[PDB]
Design a protein around this ligand. Structure first.
Ligand SMILES: Cc1cc2nc3c(=O)[nH]c(=O)nc-3n(C[C@H](O)[C@H](O)[C@H](O)COP(=O)(O)OP(=O)(O)OC[C@H]3O[C@@H](n4cnc5c(N)ncnc54)[C@H](O)[C@@H]3O)c2cc1C
Ligand SMILES: O=C(O)c1ccccc1O
Ligand code: FES
Ligand code: FES
Ligand SMILES: [Ca+2]
Length: 1297
């Protein structure tokens, strides 16, 4: 047959013309309008698209449930399966416990990921009714969240396993019986033998083989037939490497390729077995068999522990991992280094082989003949006197690509410690999986002793050398790892020999080298949130200062909250796709649409010619809407393809051929300095006398810190929907932005119509953090022009690779400091020269650099200081705002030389800091008096509650007992100024309406992206009008209701809008008091009607502007801030000196948010900001080619904090009794300040690294270089030792920007 049949949320679905290229994600959103399931990457790493799927296991005669990635599952593979999505488990009317909990525990912010996480937890509970705290966490390996900081999510879900922010005592019980039945129709079908299905598509044919005979026969007749199972590999090739296999064939049904046979030599799994099957089956073996027969099994298991996540492993097969033949495969190494027996069948033919250097001929190739297919794999039992180990190291533990992976085996002569057989296989060292065929033989018969260790290391170092210009980069780090892995193996093997009586022969192991053999250990979380209780009085209706859940939590948790792309398409609507340059600075000589036009559905290709009025946009008018004559960065927008479906828009854009003539490019900060290529003159602040200050300097340190950039990674990429009104140049735009005003102004200026005609509407954003403060417009305008030219509605949702490439991000920094200080610690002179890489457009760069300079002093009084800034005009995607807006960069530099001051002085950091810290009443370097100073209490409470001193000791102790595992514990302070650097942007407006039924419709200039701004504004209004929040509502933000609004940024949004909403509300109360006075206790509904029937207006606007702001650089005077945010973080880490990986063991925060408008919201903002910082300083790295082209374009190569990447012990506390009167209800901004506190982790790692360096004889300087981010690479290399030494022996892949 050719009719695809399956279920979704219970309802049957029959598809008569299924296209192999159609993914369950597209079929759910665009063919069933089920939009709970989101699209965050289409790469497989965020899990926003997670959905459960069920089916009847023919074999086990049972129904099974497992999660999967909708973005990668081809529907042509879902025949006779039951899909379940977030919508299918609950609604706001009837929330499923999973949804209720995540929502109430505050686990949802922007909400764009809650459906996926909800589904992972849901799927778990369907498999394990009462999971363990550990099982719960493993559920989220394939799920990423950028707003929550993961604490709440897990704390909330904890309740399912084994004052206050919420109450699990109120959570509704779970009832497994009340879950969606399993489609009886599907059980009726399990009675008739499945047959072969064929699905013809627009350009791809898919055959679903049902029997081995069919499969081999098909391969025989058409060897070209591409096999597909989980598609987790092929899916990526088609989607990202622009591949197209016209003839697929899925054999997932065939029994043979699914059997698990227990043989004498070991367990044989069919080539199609899901990695989750292998995982579960082996896990049972290593639990009932002698530890001596499960060495290899446990090796595989260790790899799978960090192999994608639940979603991928549920469909990814073993055979797929084998045949993919990826040099970075984490299983081929283990399979080769253990001689796995692979069977290979073909119609008529049948052979068998063992994995070895011969199996992987060249790049991604194997022994298999074009017509053969991998039948099965036998994972061998470990023989007595045989030991195995598996290693893997990347940039992040959870779901990542290995930099180096390895499988190591050793077989000793019976009863001895003499090497009978030794295999060492690696991944990430060549264009394939290799073995140390040379090094290992020269080790036969030798004994497991220190001499062999030296023999191998020297051998590996020689045999596995890398070309400095080798692909991937990080040459040193990788080499070190091959050696560091073997070292762990050597130390491990010893322990195993000792644990066999031959202890005496191999020799006891140093009790400080033991930890170096340990496998990664979990250790249960322990969080503690602390905030103030609202006065004993405060009526229960006054929610200001109460932990009120984000108003949209339930909706976000249920998939009903709507996001731009969720809005349905007009039958009308067209799709748009941007066309960017592939040259950093060329001259466009010719554009060719010839091919684009052949694409079915092609409407047109917009260029600079098609712009009605002006082609000059951007916050400083130095940018083009569409490149004209020359491109000035890779990812520069040249045009826009317009077609019906997004699929055709893309294929068409690919048909737009361009020709260039390159020009001198200015890629790096250096390139810029050498070319005097900047954005304006240099900014400078200076107080005191430098020469004089340096003269009195006992010490004087110089240095250069470099801070990497950072991609915002809002789960919801950029999206705009433009609907043309047909008359007067009227246009409504549904946009994911934090800046309606400029989105509007840019579309107006671009079209040639007044702002009169343009309306921009923002309901909510799935995260923004400054990335949508002005860069969204680059998409907005393109669509506006598509609408204005077709008359039809046009829409554009950017894919991740396009968003990351195009939208820019945080500013990379280069500091050149020279601090002068006394032996006492006291600093007396500072001089920093910052250099930010601005990019293609000025944008907000120069204002970011002004913020940096404003915080180069972090928390310290420095009598003689002078900082300067220069913004580099480079041929790269222009960079913008990012939570912190230059503040972190400027503070990381400050805390860097500060740390080196402590070291050089030999004094304890805490003391060096407390000494130089500001005092209540001091002026800053820009002369702003610091009144209501509160940092000291944050400091004294943090040391006290985090029990610093005592733990400082426990850390030293741990270090004395551990050689290849060191711990750090650093306490950092921060000072963040609140207000826009541009004074007039400090204004907010609101519009309130009270209808005759009493209900109130409120709106303000600020947008919503996860911060819970509306929730707060609602709480403000509710307290202002003295009526329950239940009667108030905010539906969206738009230029209709409130005009000329500042972008939602600078943490000020709740300060500005909250003040506006307040005034508006006071106007209403004014009007209403005459009626109130008459009937004092009469209901609110009553006063409203009276006012109405008395012709009294029940609608008013509210406005506010921050007073007394205004700073002059020319005279270094005038306060540029309304007030200051204050806080202290105390983090503890524990690095693995042998790999670079580490783990944040504990953090303690004490933040000053004045009288919090909403404790729960703020604490969630503190945790979230922090985790964003922790990623900026230790995980997130962007790599650009030498030619200025970005390489890291998806979560696969950009690793943002994951679930397990957060302080195992997260403690947050809000400073008590610290009312900030001058702000809405004595509160304080809280969105950005908390982010730099993640520094404490950076410098705790600094310590742990120094402690390791201190036990290595060779001095080689004590004040080493540790640039940001402190990735595994930077950390390992910094731990110079016998291994970093024996392996350090242009044309490189990347380059420092
Ligand atoms: C987010 C994410 C994270 C990942 N993490 C990791 C990781 O940590 N380590 C790692 O190694 N991989 C990882 N992978 C890669 C991938 O999941 C594996 O390579 C997977 O095991 C491939 O299996 P599949 O069934 O999905 O293959 P498919 O994509 O269906 O097929 C892959 C290739 O195998 C061939 N093939 C499949 N079965 C057979 C057979 N029986 N006989 C002959 N040829 C066959 C096909 O022709 C095709 O070329 C990740 C992928 C994603 C998307
Ligand atoms: O001044 C700004 O424009 C600004 C923007 C985002 C965040 C903080 C800021 O000061
Ligand atoms: S979209 Fe499918 S994993 Fe992120
Ligand atoms: S709350 Fe999850 S991506 Fe924002
Ligand atoms: Ca810029």
């Amino acid at each position: 047959a050719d009719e695809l049949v399956f279920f979704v949320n219970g309802k049957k679905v029959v598809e008569k013309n299924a296209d192999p290229e159609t993914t369950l994600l597209v079929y759910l959103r665009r063919k069933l309008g089920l939009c709970g399931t989101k699209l965050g990457c289409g790469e497989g790493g965020c899990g926003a698209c997670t959905v459960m799927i069920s089916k009847y296991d023919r074999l086990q005669n049972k129904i099974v449930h497992f999660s999967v990635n909708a973005c990668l599952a081809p529907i042509c593979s879902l025949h006779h399966v039951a899909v379940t999505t977030v919508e299918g488990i609950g609604n706001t009317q009837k929330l499923h416990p999973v949804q209720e909990r995540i929502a109430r525990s505050h686990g949802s912010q922007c909400g764009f990921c809650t459906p996926g996480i909800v589904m992972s937890m849901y799927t778990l509970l369907r498999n394990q009714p009462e999971p363990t705290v550990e099982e719960i966490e493993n559920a989220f390996q394939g799920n990423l969240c950028r707003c929550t900081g993961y604490r709440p999510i897990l704390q909330g879900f904890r309740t399912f396993a084994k004052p206050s922010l919420f109450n699990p005592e109120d959570f509704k019980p779970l009832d497994p019986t009340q879950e969606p039945i399993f489609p009886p129709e599907l059980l009726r079908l399990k009675d008739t033998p499945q047959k072969k299905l064929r699905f013809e598509g627009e350009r791809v044919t898919w055959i679903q083989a049902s029997t081995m005979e069919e499969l081999l026969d098909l391969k025989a007749q058409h060897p070209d037939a591409k096999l597909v199972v989980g598609n987790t590999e092929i899916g990526i090739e088609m989607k990202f490497k622009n591949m197209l296999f016209p003839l697929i064939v899925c054999p997932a049904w065939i029994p043979e390729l699914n059997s698990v046979v227990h043989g004498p030599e070991g367990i044989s799994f069919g080539a199609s077995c899901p990695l989750s099957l292998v995982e579960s089956v082996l896990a049972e073996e290593i639990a009932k068999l002698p530890e001596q027969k499960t060495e290899v099994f446990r090796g595989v298991m260790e790899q799978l522990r960090w192999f994608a996540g639940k979603q991928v492993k549920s469909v990814a097969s073993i055979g797929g991992n084998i045949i993919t033949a990826s040099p970075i495969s984490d299983l081929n190494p283990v399979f080769m280094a253990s001689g796995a027996k692979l069977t290979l069948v073909s119609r008529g033919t049948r052979r068998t082989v063992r994995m070895d250097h011969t199996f992987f001929p060249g790049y991604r190739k194997t022994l298999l003949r074009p017509e053969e297919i991998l039948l099965s794999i036998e994972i061998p039992y470990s023989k007595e006197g045989e030991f195995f180990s598996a290693f893997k190291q990347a940039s992040r533990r959870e779901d990542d690509i290995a930099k180096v992976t390895s499988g190591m085996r050793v077989l000793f002569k019976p009863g001895t410690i003499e090497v009978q057989e030794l295999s060492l296989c690696f991944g990430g060292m060549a264009d394939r999986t290799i073995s140390a065929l040379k090094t290992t033989p020269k080790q036969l018969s030798k004994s497991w002793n220190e001499e062999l260790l030296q023999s191998v290391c020297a051998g590996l170092a020689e045999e596995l050398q890398l070309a400095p210009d080798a692909p991937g980069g990080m040459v040193e780090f990788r080499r070190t790892l091959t050696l560091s892995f073997f070292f762990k193996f050597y130390l491990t093997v010893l322990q195993k020999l000792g644990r066999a009586d031959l202890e005496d022969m191999a020799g006891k192991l140093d009790p400080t080298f033991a930890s170096a053999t340990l496998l990664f250990q979990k250790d249960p979380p322990a969080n503690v949130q602390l905030f103030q209780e609202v006065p004993k009085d405060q009526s229960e209706e006054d929610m200001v200062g109460r932990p009120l859940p984000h108003l949209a939590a339930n909706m976000q948790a249920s998939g009903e909250a709507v996001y731009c792309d969720d809005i349905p398409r007009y039958e009308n609507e067209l799709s748009l796709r941007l066309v960017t340059s592939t040259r950093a600075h060329a001259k466009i000589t010719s554009i060719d649409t010839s091919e684009a036009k052949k694409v079915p559905g092609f409407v047109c290709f917009l260029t600079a010619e098609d712009v009605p009025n002006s082609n000059a946009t951007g916050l400083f008018n130095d940018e083009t809407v569409f490149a004209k004559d020359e491109v000035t960065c890779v990812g520069h927008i040249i045009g826009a393809v317009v077609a019906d479906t997004p699929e055709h828009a893309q294929r068409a854009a690919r048909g737009v051929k361009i020709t260039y003539e390159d020009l001198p490019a200015i890629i790096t900060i250096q390139d810029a300095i050498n070319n005097n290529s900047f954005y304006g003159s240099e900014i400078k602040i200076e107080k005191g006398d430098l020469k004089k200050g340096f003269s009195e300097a006992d010490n004087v340190v110089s240095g250069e810190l470099y801070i990497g950039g950072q991609e915002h990674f809002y789960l919801e990429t950029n999206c705009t929907i433009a609907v043309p009104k047909g008359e007067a140049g009227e246009m409504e735009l549904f946009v994911s932005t934090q800046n309606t005003m400029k989105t509007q102004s840019f579309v107006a200026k671009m079209l040639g119509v007044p702002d009169n005609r343009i309306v921009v509407r923002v309901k909510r954003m799935g995260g923004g953090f400054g990335g949508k403060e002005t860069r969204s417009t680059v998409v907005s305008t393109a669509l506006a022009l598509a609408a204005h030219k077709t008359g039809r509605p046009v829409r554009c949702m950017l894919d991740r690779d396009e968003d990351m490439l195009i939208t820019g991000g945080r500013h990379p920094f280069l500091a050149k400091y020279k601090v002068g200080f006394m032996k006492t610690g006291t600093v007396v002179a500072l001089e920093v020269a910052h250099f930010s890489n601005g990019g293609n457009t000025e944008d907000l760069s120069r204002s970011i650099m002004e913020r940096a300079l404003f915080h180069m002093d972090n928390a310290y009084k420095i009598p003689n200081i002078r900082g300067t800034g220069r913004i580099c005009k480079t041929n790269l995607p222009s960079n913008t705002a990012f939570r912190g807006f230059g503040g972190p960069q400027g503070m990381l530099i400050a805390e860097y030389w500060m740390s080196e001051v402590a070291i050089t002085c030999g004094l304890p950091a805490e003391e060096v800091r407390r000494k130089n810290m500001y005092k209540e009443g001091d002026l800053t370097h820009f002369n702003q008096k610091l009144e209501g100073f509160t940092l000291p209490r944050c400091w004294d409470e943090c040391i006290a509650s985090s029990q610093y001193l005592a733990r400082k000791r426990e850390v030293e102790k741990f270090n004395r007992e551990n050689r290849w595992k060191k711990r750090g514990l650093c306490i950092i302070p921060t000072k963040f100024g609140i207000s826009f650097t541009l004074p007039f942007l400090n204004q907010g407006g609101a519009l309130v309406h009270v209808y005759t039924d009493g209900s109130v419709l409120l709106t303000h200039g600020g947008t919503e992206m996860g911060q819970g701004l509306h929730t707060k504004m609602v709480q403000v209004a509710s307290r202002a009008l003295k009526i329950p929040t239940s009667k108030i509502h905010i539906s969206e933000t738009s230029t209709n209701t409130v005009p000329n609004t500042s972008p939602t940024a600078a943490s000020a949004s709740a300060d500005l809008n909250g003040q506006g909403v307040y005034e508006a509300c006071q106007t209403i109360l004014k009007r209403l008091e005459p009626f109130k006075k008459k009937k004092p206790t009469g209901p609110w509904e009553a006063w409203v009607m009276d006012a109405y029937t008395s012709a009294v207006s029940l609608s008013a606007t509210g406005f506010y502007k921050t007073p007394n702001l205004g700073y002059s650089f020319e005279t270094n005077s005038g306060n540029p801030f309304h007030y200051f945010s204050y806080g202290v973080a105390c983090s503890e880490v524990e690095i693995d000196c042998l790999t670079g990986d580490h783990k944040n063991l504990r953090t303690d925060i004490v933040m000053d948010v004045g009288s919090s408008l909403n404790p729960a919201i703020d604490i969630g903002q503190v945790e979230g900001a922090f985790v964003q910082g922790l990623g900026l300083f230790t995980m997130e790295e962007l790599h650009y080619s030498p030619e200025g082209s970005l390489h890291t374009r998806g979560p696969s190569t950009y690793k943002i904090p994951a679930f397990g990447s957060i302080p195992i012990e997260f403690r947050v506390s809000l400073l008590r009794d610290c009312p900030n009167k001058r702000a809405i209800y004595a509160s304080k901004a809280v969105g950005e300040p908390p982010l730099f506190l993640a520094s404490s982790i950076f410098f705790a790692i600094k310590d742990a690294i120094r402690a390791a360096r201190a036990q290595h004889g060779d001095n080689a300087k004590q004040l080493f270089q540790l640039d940001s981010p402190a990735t595994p690479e930077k950390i390992r290399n910094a731990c110079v030792d016998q291994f970093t030494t024996l392996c350090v022996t242009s044309k490189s892949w990347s380059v420092r920007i």
